[PDB]
């Protein structure tokens, strides 16, 4: 993606649906084309 739009622009905090857990979901690619950060992400502020 161009993930920075999701990083800065407002969210769709919506009724969601997960199978097992979201980390296992993205580690099985239940979700297609994810992105994952444990840390306080600094790359959303360098553009």
């Amino acid at each position: 993606e161009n993930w920075t739009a999701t990083e800065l622009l407002p969210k769709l905090d919506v009724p969601i649906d997960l199978l097992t857990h979201i980390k296992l979901s993205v580690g099985e690619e239940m979700f297609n084309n994810f992105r994952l950060y444990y840390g306080d992400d600094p790359e959303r502020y360098n553009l």
Binding site: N2, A5, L8, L9, P10, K11
Partner: protein
């Protein structure tokens, strides 16, 4: 347990529409962000709302 009843349903399809503001996003780079005008108000508003 099967009950046979009339179900409320839509009688037409949905509308997803390209704004004037959204059409420039096409001829810039072919990829369309929905609510592209809505996030425009958001940057002159706070950080994320």
């Amino acid at each position: 347990s099967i009950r046979r009843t009339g179900v409320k349903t839509p009688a037409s399809y949905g509308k997803f529409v390209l704004s004037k503001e959204n059409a420039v996003t096409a001829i810039a780079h072919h990829a369309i962000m929905a609510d592209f005008s809505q996030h425009a108000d958001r940057i002159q508003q706070s950080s994320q709302k």
